[PDB]
Amino acid sequence: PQITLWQRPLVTIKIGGQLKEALLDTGADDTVLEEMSLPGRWKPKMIGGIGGFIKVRQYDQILIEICGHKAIGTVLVGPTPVNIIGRNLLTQIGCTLNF
Amino acid sequence: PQITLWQRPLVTIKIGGQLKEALLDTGADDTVLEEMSLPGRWKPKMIGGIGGFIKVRQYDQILIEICGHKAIGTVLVGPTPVNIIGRNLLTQIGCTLNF
């Protein structure tokens, strides 16, 4: 799908069997999800943006379905105000910017 | 141009006669620029993302040339780690996401 930017580019994702909305964020190197329950092992980690830093848990090799195309990769979980799908997964679904 | 996401989608902008590099950021409602010298009046303002908030000055109706397409709109200036071109201006240069 082509998605214009007059509103927030929110899409539906399925991850860990749950459904969430998240923001396609070309500004984000990685993908960060709100406090949620996820399988596997994980290393702690801190990430920054505007405003500063949060502590997050980092899980590797997680399957995610983003608007119905599947991606596997790293996912951080922590106290983010919004779920964000970062470049690490956007590249796997073939996501490009065009103008 | 079509721009894939394997690296940060950094482009060259001209604003206030100066040149800067900035990040096309579909996660950003507005455009925020590092500490720089800009004309006109301005209201103070605070914005948030991940990590929290910063105080910024807000200037309205600023011309900006983003990879050589011109856009006019609001521009915030403040202590951001990276210059970010937000949706307020991406829409004016015709920017879309496609996958």
Strands B96-98 and B2-3, by their bridges, are unpaired
* All structural domains of chain B with their residue ranges: 1-99
Which top CATH class is A1-99? mainly beta
Spatial distance between the Cα atoms of A31 and A58, rounded to a whole number of angstroms: 10
DSSP state of B40: S
Way the structure was solved: X-ray
Burial of A38 (0-12, 13-18, 19+ CB in 10 A): middle
Q: Hey, what are B29's tokens?
A: 């409602």
Instruction: Name the one residue in this structure whose structure tokens are 């807000």.
Output: B58
**B88–chain A nearest CA distance, Å:** 8
Resolution to one decimal, Å: 2.2
The radius of gyration of chain A from alpha carbons, rounded to an integer in Å, stands at 13
Active-site residue set of B: 25
Q: Hey, what are B50's tokens?
A: 């991940």
CB distance from B17 to chain A under 8 Å? Answer: no
Strands B32-33 and B43-49, by their bridges, are unpaired
Instruction: Name the one residue in this structure whose structure tokens are 């590797």.
Output: A60
3-state class of A88 per DSSP?
Answer: helix
The answer to whether the CB of B57 falls within 8 A of the CB of B44 is yes
Residues 18-77 of A with CB under 8 A from B: 23-29, 32, 47-54, 67, 69
